[PDB]
Amino acid sequence: TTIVGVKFNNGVVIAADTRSTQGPIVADKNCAKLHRISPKIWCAGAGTAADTEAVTQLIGSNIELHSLYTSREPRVVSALQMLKQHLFKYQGHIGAYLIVAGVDPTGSHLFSIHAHGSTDVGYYLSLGSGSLAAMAVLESHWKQDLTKEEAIKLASDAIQAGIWNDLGSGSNVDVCVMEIGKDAEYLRNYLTPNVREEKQKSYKFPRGTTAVLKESIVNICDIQEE
Amino acid sequence: NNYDGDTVTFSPTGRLFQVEYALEAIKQGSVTVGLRSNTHAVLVALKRNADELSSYQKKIIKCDEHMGLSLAGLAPDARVLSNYLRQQCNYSSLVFNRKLAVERAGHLLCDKAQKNTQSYGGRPYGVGLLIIGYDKSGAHLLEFQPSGNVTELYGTAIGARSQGAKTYLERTLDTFIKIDGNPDELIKAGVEAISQSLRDESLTVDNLSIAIVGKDTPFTIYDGEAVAKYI
């Protein structure tokens, strides 16, 4: 689980992997860790999966409210503030590790929030358990004033290096590019690392190979005519 | 009921008529007289029976061993207020290790009246209290109204025919201020004071109720054959 948020002058690109694990078991080869606080404010979550989705749920509802009240497009910091509050109160019993990225009529933005209520700023943030491996690449190759081509590159390659130096990372690489003054593009499966090899023989079995002890029919379809 | 009804209204006269109604509680009350020298305070209360088989209804409530109150008006209201006063006197003994000052308790009582005069569904209390006590600043006699007015006086009265007592005290005013260290004289002067406020209701030795507080004497209530020395 590695999430990179890379800031550049024309917007912000935020990228993540799609393996979700449950301990040594890989729970899911495909989920999307990229959530939508708003159409223009995407976030990604690391840490406890349940705790990530449910909170982005809660505040996405709340910010939609707020935006309809002010008849104005949402802010990045609106979301960030709501989050901070809500987490601080359980005093870190909710483990959320979110990169909140977004454009608005004030520019591009990139924030990180911890599971206690801490928040940091940078042009350049990395979260999750593979964060370390991403950070390593990200500091040698980064420079101010990237374009969107460059930034996309850098994000995706940091994610693979996470895949190849972290066991919790692995899968397709999803990216979302949010630029100022344009609709946000979801580049899902931008780069596919690792395809499953072809089984050497099929394992389809003939009919009647298992036994049936009895059988019955029940129809959940409807309650009845006559 | 035009402006007369309710403890929330005005009153194009600037008034409220509930207050005056409650002061009628004083008027239909029996007379009581309080007077203080600089070393003793004395309350002389005219108890009153309902009939001959009935006894007399008490009029002086001990609040503390240096502090006393006597009611004039509705008994049931007097009962709320007396409990309250004892409560904060024991409070002051507890928290500050200090006797509760008279001057102060008047103000506490003031607010407690004010707020049933504030809210709708309250009422003004229909009892006026005379509160005597002897503290570190000496003797004190306070007059408490249904309005919530507390006043400090040398000697005062409330009840029916309260005026006839005030005139008496207006003549004998500078007499009882100069008498100090002789409580007996003050008590006799109060008996004579309340003689002027009889309806041919003669002073008996169980109709008169005396209570004193001194420099050297805790608060005491005399009744029965303790009052015969003065009658």
């Binding site: 104005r72 609106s78 960030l80 503030q81 | -």
Partner: protein, 242 residues
Amino acid sequence: AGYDRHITIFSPEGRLYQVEYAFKATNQTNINSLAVRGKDCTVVISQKKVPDKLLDPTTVSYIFCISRTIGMVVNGPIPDARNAALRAKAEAAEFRYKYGYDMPCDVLAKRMANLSQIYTQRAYMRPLGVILTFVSVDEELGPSIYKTDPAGYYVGYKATATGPKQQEITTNLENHFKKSKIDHINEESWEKVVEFAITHMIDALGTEFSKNDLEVGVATKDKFFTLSAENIEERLVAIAEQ
């Protein structure tokens, strides 16, 4: 029933007399206000009058600072003025707290409007008898004026006036934007907009002014300020030399 108008309940005409009566208590100070939009500023003037000398003139005010960018000008009794001012300051603090940026004027107009609605839906609330003018310079909407009233209704404006004789001022503003053919004065310095405003006020009310007879509030970018009498005097002198 005999009660339709001691509580907030419709009449046989389908109406709220009570709220009407609220509108009939906004003209008791008989202060007038005039507010216009510059090009990068917003300007509002109100009368100041003291009935006696033994008042201190400084404390007599009707331009109340709510936010650092939103000024509030009140028409109607001063007790209700103060209650409204307090309301609004509370909401402003709370917006900054929960959303991480200062309250927009639009949002404040609506919040206060909804509170108004609540005062005319509960049977034991008395409505405010104040019309509030919110002057701001926004960076998303530009200079703006929003007017709310005791009903809980609000509307935007190009310019607006309030007071008992504010029809005169309406005439003035109407003719002005008739000639200009555009919804705001094109002036790039806030001073001259103060000047223009005072000119229309002298024309409209028919009476000349002095530094102690005026009160001026200006919303520039990222700020709100009020002028003191000394600076108001200077504006008056520069009017004669136009």
